[PDB]
């Protein structure tokens, strides 16, 4: 039951020092080598560096001077000395698959999201998505919610507090022309099973909003 869980991903202005922490469960951190790997949205995996059990860190050529990896008894750290907008990515923590080794790495953490931009954090505005009432109704209808203009990621959308999951399609987010993100979620239900409510949570702004949508 070994697992990892990164922490510290947040929105920062460029040049502001940021530290990411990787807590470890199910195994002794003292017996394994650890590595940090980042992934910009839509881009490939980028190796950053490895911290060995002796405490010495070995970085990639491009990462030298821009990152710092450190080790404690129970945590592994990653500090971005002066972030730029190019540093926006999801940062992963990985244990070496075996002790006394650095050849391959498993298991991995879910990753933590780092956002570097000058824009202020912004809560999302939620709008109902319903068919135009002019057309004839059907026994099955599709309703949705538009989550527009939020920064930074992520945002969590559920329906009926998570008790309704069939037919739910939550499309991945898109970064707008501005720095703001946006996405939409839809669900198809019978006209008898009414109503449906979408729950939108934006942890970056401590924002939770419910929206009950009706066909009109």
């Amino acid at each position: 039951g070994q697992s990892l869980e990164e922490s510290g991903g947040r929105l920062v202005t460029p040049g502001t020092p940021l530290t990411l922490t990787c807590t470890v469960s199910g195994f002794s951190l003292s017996n394994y080598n650890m590595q940090w790997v980042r992934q910009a949205p839509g881009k490939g995996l980028e190796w950053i560096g490895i911290v060995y059990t002796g405490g010495v860190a070995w970085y990639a050529r491009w990462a030298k001077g821009r990152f710092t990896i450190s080790r404690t008894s129970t945590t592994v750290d990653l500090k971005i000395t002066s972030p730029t907008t190019e540093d926006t990515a999801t940062y992963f923590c990985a244990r070496a698959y075996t002790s006394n080794s650095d050849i391959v790495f498993d298991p991995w953490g879910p990753g933590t999201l780092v956002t570097v931009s000058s824009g202020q954090p912004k809560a999302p505005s939620v709008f109902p998505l319903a068919p135009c009432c002019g057309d004839t109704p059907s026994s099955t209808v599709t309703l949705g919610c538009l989550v527009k203009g939020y920064l930074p990621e992520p945002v969590t959308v559920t329906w009926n507090s998570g008790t309704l999951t069939n037919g739910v399609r939550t499309f991945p987010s898109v970064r707008q022309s501005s720095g703001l993100y946006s996405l939409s979620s839809v669900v198809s239900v019978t006209s008898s099973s009414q109503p449906v409510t979408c729950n939108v949570a934006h942890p970056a702004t401590n924002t939770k909003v419910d929206k009950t949508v009706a066909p009109s």
């Binding site: 790997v37 490939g44 995996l45 980028e46 190796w47 490895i50 070995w58 990639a60 050529r61 491009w62 080794s101 650095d102 050849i103 391959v104 790495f105």
Partner: peptide, 15 residues
Amino acid sequence: YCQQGYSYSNVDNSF
């Protein structure tokens, strides 16, 4: 993705 663990010296990306 393929990842090599032979050497991390002068490496830009192990992946």
